[PDB]
Symmetry: C3
Subunit: 313 residues, 3 copies
């Protein structure tokens, strides 16, 4: 397909620093070249320069609010620009707090978008329910219209305007959800397939139900926010918040191959890859290699094989 690459070297949504190198190690893995090797029209919009915000004391428990809020604001603008150029935005990011800007900018051009959130976490804590204070665990709360009223005026996010409803999002891969987050899940009736649902139904039925749920009424642009920790740490160990018993490499590729086949992928986020957290150089390459594989599947690379519209014999 036609892609718009945008690097988001940002880490202030969480504690560990190596995540801001995500764009770097992914590009170094040959991601752009691999994409072009497929039927892909690629345009690199570069790495966003996230100016340093020295004065950024916590808002209550919430850490680096101004830095996070600004980074998302800048990203929102870049994503909308790539979308206005008629390209699928591909955000190579640092931490998941960037989802606020990615989905926000995406929704500016396509308000009817539907979101698929692949993650071990729901990232739906509010600045008031969070216990860690890390903003990468709160992006969804800022985007949901139903939660508008339970979100205090956190410095750096006055530009935010909830752009999705509880029913325009589906979670896949959940296995470490905070109490307050679970309360929000059940209270708002959010659609989710935790690892339990995946075990019960199988990834095939999960995807069928996911896509039917979001595209049932009518077709709409899809936004895939992919947290690499959604996959089991045996595949993506170099990440800040790993949780055992995750989605397999295969399921990861299944999810993305199915999303690709819809022809509706509109926005994509490959988040939380932290090269500095690899216990070994191999754990780093294993994580980056899996992240690239998942990305390539989102744009057409199929396990059964691919061939050009010609007569090979």
């Amino acid at each position: 397909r036609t892609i718009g690459i945008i690097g988001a070297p940002f880490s202030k949504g969480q504690p560990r620093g190596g995540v801001e190198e995500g764009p770097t190690v992914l590009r170094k893995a040959g991601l752009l070249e691999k994409l072009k090797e497929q039927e892909c029209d690629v345009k690199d919009y570069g790495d966003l320069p996230f100016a340093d915000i020295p004065n950024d004391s916590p808002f209550q428990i919430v850490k680096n609010p101004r830095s996070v809020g600004k980074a998302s604001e800048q990203l929102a603008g870049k994503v909308a620009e790539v979308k206005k150029n008629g390209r699928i935005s591909l955000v190579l990011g640092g931490d998941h707090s960037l989802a606020i800007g990615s989905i926000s900018g995406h929704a500016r051009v396509h308000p009817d978008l539907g979101v698929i959130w692949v993650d071990a976490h729901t990232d739906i804590n509010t600045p008031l329910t969070t216990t860690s204070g890390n903003l990468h665990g709160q992006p969804v709360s800022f985007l949901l219209k139903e939660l508008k009223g339970k979100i205090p005026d956190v410095p750096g996010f006055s530009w935010v305007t909830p752009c999705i409803s509880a029913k325009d999002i589906v979670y896949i891969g959940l296995r470490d959800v905070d109490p307050g987050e679970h309360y929000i899940l059940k209270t708002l009736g959010i659609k989710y397939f935790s690892m339990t649902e995946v075990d019960r139904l199988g990834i095939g039925k999960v995807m069928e139900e996911t896509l039917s749920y979001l595209l049932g009424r009518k077709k709409r642009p899809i936004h895939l926010s992919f947290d690499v920790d959604g996959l089991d740490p045996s595949f993506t160990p170099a990440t800040g918040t790993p949780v055992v018993g995750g989605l397999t490499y295969r399921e990861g590729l299944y999810i993305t191959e199915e999303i690709y086949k819809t022809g509706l992928l509109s926005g994509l986020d490959i988040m939380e890859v932290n090269p500095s957290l690899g216990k070994t150089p191999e754990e780093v390459t294993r994580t980056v290699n899996t992240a690239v594989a998942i990305t390539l599947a989102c744009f057409g690379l199929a396990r059964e094989g691919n061939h050009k519209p010609i007569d090979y014999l």
Copy 2:
């Protein structure tokens, strides 16, 4: 839920000695504290003191019959006492021979109980079909009423009285069954889901069929005897009789989450954890960590998340 913890530091049902440290490493992993962290009312009935039986020569091929028989007799009494206190018995054990006492004592208070046996083995050898002579591979034969007549008078087990019928037990995870055991399986018509059935149907259908099979006619108390070697050794390596191709971490949690949701868990055994068999300190923690996780799922810990009956917003 409401739990009654009882440690069973016993190993004479098999050759390797480290298994008697199971209660110790599990408690040290913070199992009691983790349980209390959930909606659990926990009461530790302590570790059973299994007096030394110096004179215990083999009965034919059967090893340490008096020691094994006595340990189960003592455990049977403790389990019945915890059951009479209105608590779910949680036996942190050594080897699986202890199942004879656990199920026996449990059945004294709840004769209508149904058993789910998660294991790589059927543990249904009789003292006459066993080839190893290890009693942890024969517990089920002593408990089945239909096999009463094929069980010689083994020193130490005169107190035993078969308490379950062939149709009150379901096996999950089988992958190393002895010939005589398979003969008993097919002859008595015992319900089982070997790894082959799990591969064929998926763990979801397996659990649906398991619970429908045991609770179809009417609801009854459930006894879960969980041998950690039922799970693949990539998850629980520190165990005496590991067999490759086992149940995954995920399936292990699925089985237990589903049992929990029935609200009928009445007795639980977490067996065969042998810290001394870990090739590395990490293999030990990996095994103990998985054992704790499985235990927590049996008492409510759900992957989709948990929340108190309050308004979190």
Copy 3:
């Protein structure tokens, strides 16, 4: 069952040399003894002596054509001889190019045979579509009647005569298919279950559909060509062309147990085991151990257990 073992220490269908030791390490693993331990009548037809062909320059891009062609010709004759003796041929091989001779000889005695190809690759490149020039990636093209006309006269294969039609073969495990191969797949309407189909349907449904597809109309002899790289490299690392995200140990045993139960297994190939490629001695034993396990399942070894037709009690 009744087996006819034939060693095929051959490697010239690909670059890496250790694969010709496959027969050796498998026999050393006790394969013959293990088979006899089951209800198996085993006869070792020995290791085929593949005479050295010093003058064998490439045919265009195609490497070692005369050596490969001769090795398959010799193997075809041996397989037909074992089949005429009323035995299931078990080819312990080197590289997969040997499939040309195995299926060829098998089809001489049983022209109505159906093939199940477990592999990460389709091995259907023609001498003209191949980009590697390695013949182990082209065996199927030489056997398919529909491709007769697109196969140049390659030195060493004048003895070949396509013996199977597009609809007498089913692929399972595909995850690295070349463009030209995919073109052939879709153009000839070949039945396949890539890793994507396995993820979608589950290995149970895959096997049901595979066997129904090949045995629907009427029962016929089955030929299983098993490339060990079909299974994930976490199980069979010592192989020349490994690809991540493969079939699990369990699925491997499921496939073969189901094939065994048909009672129609007529020919079997255990290919691509290369002891020299093991990064460690354990990776070598892990690969050989998995290969033996898969082989034993093909001849009756069931995970639920096995028992002789006698009264064990």
